[PDB]
Amino acid sequence: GADGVGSSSGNWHCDSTWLGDRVITTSTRTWALPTYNNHLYKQISNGTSGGSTNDNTYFGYSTPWGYFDFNRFHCHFSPRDWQRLINNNWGFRPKRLNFKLFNIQVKEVTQNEGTKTIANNLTSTIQVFTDSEYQLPYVLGSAHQGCLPPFPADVFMIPQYGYLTLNNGSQAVGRSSFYCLEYFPSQMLRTGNNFEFSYQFEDVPFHSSYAHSQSLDRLMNPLIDQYLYYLSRTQSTGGTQGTQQLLFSQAGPANMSAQAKNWLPGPCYRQQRVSTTLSQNNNSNFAWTGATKYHLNGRDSLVNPGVAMATHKDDEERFFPSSGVLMFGKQGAGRDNVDYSSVMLTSEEEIKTTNPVATEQYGVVADNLQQTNTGPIVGNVNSQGALPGMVWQNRDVYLQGPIWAKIPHTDGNFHPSPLMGGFGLKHPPPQILIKNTPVPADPPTTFSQAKLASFITQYSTGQVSVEIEWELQKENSKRWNPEIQYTSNYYKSTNVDFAVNTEGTYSEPRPIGTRYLTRNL
Amino acid sequence: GADGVGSSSGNWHCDSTWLGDRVITTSTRTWALPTYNNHLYKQISNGTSGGSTNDNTYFGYSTPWGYFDFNRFHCHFSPRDWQRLINNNWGFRPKRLNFKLFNIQVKEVTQNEGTKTIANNLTSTIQVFTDSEYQLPYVLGSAHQGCLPPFPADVFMIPQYGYLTLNNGSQAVGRSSFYCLEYFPSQMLRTGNNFEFSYQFEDVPFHSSYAHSQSLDRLMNPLIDQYLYYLSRTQSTGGTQGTQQLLFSQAGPANMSAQAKNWLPGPCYRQQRVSTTLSQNNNSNFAWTGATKYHLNGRDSLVNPGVAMATHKDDEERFFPSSGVLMFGKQGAGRDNVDYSSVMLTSEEEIKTTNPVATEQYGVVADNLQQTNTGPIVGNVNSQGALPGMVWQNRDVYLQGPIWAKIPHTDGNFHPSPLMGGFGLKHPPPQILIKNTPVPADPPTTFSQAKLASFITQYSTGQVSVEIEWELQKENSKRWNPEIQYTSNYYKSTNVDFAVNTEGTYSEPRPIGTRYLTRNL
Amino acid sequence: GADGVGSSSGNWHCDSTWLGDRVITTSTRTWALPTYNNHLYKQISNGTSGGSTNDNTYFGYSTPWGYFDFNRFHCHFSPRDWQRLINNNWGFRPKRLNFKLFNIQVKEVTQNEGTKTIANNLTSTIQVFTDSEYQLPYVLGSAHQGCLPPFPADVFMIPQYGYLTLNNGSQAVGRSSFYCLEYFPSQMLRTGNNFEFSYQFEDVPFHSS
């Protein structure tokens, strides 16, 4: 080894490099791993016998271990480096990543009455194992808090680990699995050690970063008619009587709606439409009641976000689907009943081309069968499954949103793109679990059967580094006039955006979409 | 070069060869390229402030360029060579194509008062560039007019080019792209030059040319019962009281409806049903009102054709889905309010096996939940999305219908077969744009800033050739009794079909399907 | 490495040598790097709405980092060695320089009521990066205080870093740049490590003496 506490195991690399198509972006932060659950696995459950309803019942365990979550973009891209990505490129996908712990140091805190003193414990060691066979519940991708902070000057606290399993009410059915974490081979790192592992993403499709320049129904040619015919009129034209006759015509630029087309909009699953204008919405609480839910195993689940769908039609920015759009918070936003002004509502408007309005009917079909005595009748189709000849475009990843998700290992899936966005992976980056090694206090002089319940209060810190080597899909486009670009406000402001304020508080003002450059549908 | 106007750049090849599985079919025609828009790009739009409704608003440009459209079958197959294709083979797909301009000659026309004289301009040249990177709106496949004429003795006029882009009302949103065509590298051809390029289709699935001999629900064995059981009767059998009891049985040839099956019909999206018998249809105009539409971006669009679906059930030939079936015209058919007798209505009846009736419900499901006090209730499912275990068969290409279409470059698509039929291609044959080089009239003696507005009236002509090398899927079938074959009428007629009439007018009497040979589902 | 806290990383060289035309002058001092801004970047500004006039308005950030300033002569020349320079020569210009941290030691101070005790923290490490691409505001040369003391027996306190950017009044215009310092590759030095780098001045005209 020849290392010891005399040296620093690792150096600080926060550098990002743009090389040809590749772009290699690394980071580092400072983490403090608190002791969890006094080192006790615990069964946790919430029953429907309490005030909880049948939807909120869960069962599972909360482990002492804790896990690193880097899954979000803003970990790995500075708001400038995310500008060079969305402005200059069509698509990007990862290739490989690399991960390092270093400069690990441990501390143990004592209490004499009020006094509080904090020393180093050289002997104590921490346990790190990457779960590479996916043999645990993979809990990343559910958009939990605790990701590496955006702004490198922040020190973050590693979030606790724990999982859920099959429940029936509060109780547990027979198949409930219990995973004891200490049961996996886990390298132990002392202060002189570093930890490192490499991972190489599977081939995964380039995420689409462009807004189509042509709505799906305008793919026609404006000059020339079409050779096909449609049924224009069933009634006698230009007469005092409407006696029925079948008339046909050709579908030209005069009426473009009737022109035959080779494709269909993406699938549609309706959402209730809520207006930011307060006077327009109904006066009531319809939030949960009139929400769009799916019913599984007798447990209702609100559909958040829902499939990628255009947020609103043109000349209305105020309407948004109830649970449809991703919703972030502003810096320092309360957890409960936060006012509207403290949250940010992303907008899908770039997909209005190929995907339907979220809040409106997908289409209209005939309910009945006509007769001389009985006129035709047509109803709305709210939820339209996928049909052949349907093209849809995936939701764009945001700076704040997650990078990936694990496609569940099940027999059947249809175009497995995670709803929140980001690359679905059949073998995601393996999560990492880390814990202090519990160091017991004085055992008694006389042996006794029970396990030692008195532990030495302890927590450790260190520097963690991650690179993610990305592939950029370069952009070649002949469009004459200028594009749209993501640009900072030119007008004077009280404090700079995406940068600290007087208190030292880093505040990201607004979400940053990935779609700006344009392409032909 | 050593060519000059003294020679003919290219020879006339209209020959087609059947070689093993391959079949190599080439054509040639004569084209006259008129000058377009006095050489001016122009913004074109149609507003909803006028009489137009919100569905018919468009925005875009109409370029001076023009494009060759060979996309339709009847270009490349003589009605005989299309008979050898549909009668003797199961499937066919293209391999490579080749394209040649030659014997290009230019002319310039002048006017002295009434007099009209037409001379040759040796110096003038025309511009040809194949767009191979797909960097323009790809406008082929929308079934516009202007394809190479079917009958080689016809001389055709190259149709103009122009495209549509994002609109909001008549006006243009920010992403509206403007493609200046002269901006691409474009070879210039003088009279002594020829133009040639080759293209090799991607591997693409053989189109299916056979009608299944077994409807999807008859796949059973007529002799033997099945071991599974079904719920036959919930009521006491053979009694004065109907007290409930669960009785089961086996599903044999006696009742074949209840036999379990391993698959499902294709997806279904209903269409209104219009009868060719005039007395049966309702007396009204339901054509547009009761039509089957899809609602995208607040612009209603009639669904023409709709997904491949059986046109009508048995013992009814008169009913057809409103917008469902492809509809062609007869030779010399008017553009507007044409009578029924002048149009041709294709029929899908060959797919009744694996795909549902277009005009009828896809199935029936239960609405309610039973009780002793409350009986069961079942509604119709009009629009059924794709489910696992669903098999569907694609619409057959016609002699008149299009060959291919470009699958839009979007992240998500489900079984991307173009609705009109023909091979969907992720990199279609690159379209070709061609224009005269504008030759300005006398500029003034004194320089002035403005561009030259006085041009010499000009148009060019030449011979264009195309081969498309097809792969045929040979047919091996043990069926004992004779097949069905496409055969000409044996009875005497006033004039031969698919051939000129007294006036010299080539008239194709009827559409020719691709499905005749039969196969086992 | 084979170094550890058992050894001294570097030796004390305060020697200067006059060799032909070259003269190679080195120094060493002792520095104590206090923690700055409880580790918080902070926006700092002074408005013209206050008593300040329009000349004194500024905008910018004050970083927790701190920087070594040796930019002044009296760092590198003893009043005698500066006498041999001005009396015997027409001109002088630099060629190369060299820079070393060594014998780094860290301390952590605690408080119990009045009591004040100061111990060593072996684990703690400090971060050093030379900005060689000039990608930050270069703040040396504005004649700020805090240079290495003239007289080698003085122990000096590293001065804080912070920069100014475009302002309009107290507020910030659109082009105001914000440089987060922790964002550069920065070697981390523990007690057993030393830091060293070399730099070679561009050809620059002899100052006239």
Q: Do the chains contact at A257 and B178, CB–CB below 8 Å?
A: no
* Side-chain half-sphere exposure of B493, counting CA atoms within 13 A: 11
Q: What distance in Å separates the CA atoms of residue C164 and residue C61, rounded to the nearest whole number? A: 7
- Burial (CB count <10 Å: 0-12, 13-18, 19+), residue B372: exposed
For residue C176, the one-letter residue type is S
SS3 (DSSP) at A112: strand
Rounded to whole angstroms, how far apart are CA atoms B461 and B34? 9
Closest CA to A251 of A209, A222, A274: A222
What's the token pair of residue B354?
A: 């694996």
φ, ψ of residue A99 in degrees (nearest 5): -145, 135
Q: Say what the alpha-carbon torsion angle A346, A350, A352, A358 is, to the nearest 10 degrees.
A: -10
A503 touches chain C (CB under 8 A): yes
Q: How distant, in Å, are the alpha carbons of B418, C147, C177 from that of C139?
A: 65, 13, 15
Q: Give me A486's structure tokens.
A: 């993501």
Contacts of C3 in chain A (CB under 8 A): 6-7
Q: Is C75 helix (H, G, I), strand (E, B) or coil?
A: helix
Which residues between 236 and 275 in chain B have a beta carbon less than 8 angstroms from any beta carbon of chain A? 267, 269-274
Q: How far apart are CA A87 and CA A486, in angstroms?
A: 7
Cβ contact B455:B89 at 8 Å = no
- CA-CA distances (angstroms) from residue C206 to A76, A390, A460? 48, 76, 55
CB contact under 8 A, A5 and C171: no
Structure tokens at B230: 């079904």
Contact between residue A515 and residue A398 where contact means Cβ atoms under 8 Å apart: no
Q: How far is C147 from chain A (nearest CA, A)?
A: 27
Residue A280 zone, left/alpha/beta (φ > 0; ψ -120 to 50; rest): alpha
The strand ranges marked E within A431-515 are: 432-436, 458-473, 499-500, 506-507
CA distances, A139 to each of A162, A164, B319 (Å) = 8, 10, 56
Neighbours of chain A (3+ CB pairs under 8 A): B, C
Is A385 close to B388, i.e. CB distance below 8 A? no
Contacts of residue A15, Cβ cutoff 8 Å, sequence gap at least 6? A26, C184, C185
Instruction: List, as ranges, residues 440-499 from A with C-beta within 8 Å of C.
Output: 463, 488-496, 498-499
Give the gap in angstroms from C-alpha A38 to the nearest C-alpha of chain B: 48
**The Cα angle at residue A202 between residues A197 and A205, in degrees rounded to 5:** 135
Pairwise CB contact (< 8 Å): B392 & A388: yes
The reply to whether residue C121 touches residue A120, judged by beta carbons under 8 angstroms, is: yes
Residue pair B114/B189 in contact by the 8 Å Cβ criterion: no
Residue C20: both structure tokens together: 């032909």
Q: Specify the DSSP class assigned to residue A191.
A: T
Angle at A476 between CA A475 and CA A481, to 5 degrees: 105
Bond from prior residue into A305 cis (ω within 30 degrees of 0): yes
Residue the block writes with tokens 């500075």? A78
In whole angstroms, what is the distance from residue A493 CA to residue C166 CA? 12
C201 half-sphere exposure, CB direction, 13 A CA radius: 10
- Nearest residue, CB atoms, C3 vs list A6, A103, A498: A6
Write the single-letter amino acid at B360: E
Beta bridge pairs of residue B464: B29, B101
Residue partners of A316: CB distance under 8 A and separation at least 6: none
Does the CB of C140 have a partner CB in chain A at under 8 Å? no
Helices (H), A208-348: none
Who contacts A477 (Cβ-Cβ below 8 Å, separation ≥6)?
A517, A518, A519, B135
Q: Is C143 left (phi over 0), alpha (psi -120 to 50) or beta?
A: left
Count of A-C CB contacts under 8 Å? 123
Resolution for the entry shown, Å: 3.4
The answer to whether A494 touches C171, Cβ cutoff 8 Å, is: yes
The answer, yes or no, to whether the previous bond of B305 is cis (omega within 30 of 0) is yes
Judged by CB atoms closer than 8 Å, whether chains meet at B297 and A353 is answered as: yes
Strand-pair partners of A155: A30
Q: Which helix (H) or strand (E) holds C24?
A: strand C22-25
Residues 6+ apart with CB under 8 A from A494: C171, C172
CA distance B281 to B292: 17
Is the sign of the CA dihedral A339, A341, A345, A350 positive or negative?
A: positive
- Which 8-state DSSP code applies to residue B74? H
User: How many CB atoms within 10 Å of residue A213?
Assistant: 24
Contact call for residues A218 and A208 (beta carbons, < 8 A): no
* Euclidean distance between CA atoms A358 and B295, whole angstroms: 11
Q: Single out the residue of B288, B91, B68 nearest to residue B160, CA to CA.
A: B68
The two tokens of residue B343 are: 């149009």
Where do we find the tokens 């796949």? B219
Which residues have C-beta within 8 Å of that of residue B476, sequence separation ≥ 6?
none
Give which of C163, C117, C124, C109 is closest to C140, Cα–Cα.
C163
Helix (H) or strand (E) segment spanning residue B406: strand B404-406
Minimum-distance CB partner of A221 among B144, B359, B392: B144
Report the distance separating Cα B205 and Cα B195, nearest Å.
30
Q: Which two tokens stand for residue B521?
A: 């589902």
C-alpha closest to that of C189 among C65, C63, C104, C69: C104
Residues from chain B contacting residue A209 (CB–CB below 8 Å): none
Amino acid at C168: N
Q: Who contacts B411 (Cβ-Cβ below 8 Å, separation ≥6)?
A: A205, A207, A208, A392, A393, A394, A417
Round to whole Å and give the CA distance between B61 and B137. 11
Judging contacts by C-beta atoms under 8 Å, the chain C residues touching residue A460 are none
d(CA A309, CA A395): 8
Pair A481, B177: CB distance under 8 Å: yes
The experimental method is cryo-EM
- Residue B19 token pair: 């070689």
CB A62 within 8 A of CB A164: no
Instruction: Residue B342: name the closest of A229, C109, A316 by CA.
Output: A229
Among the partner-chain residues B175, B407, B415, the one whose CB lies closest to the CB of A518 is: B175
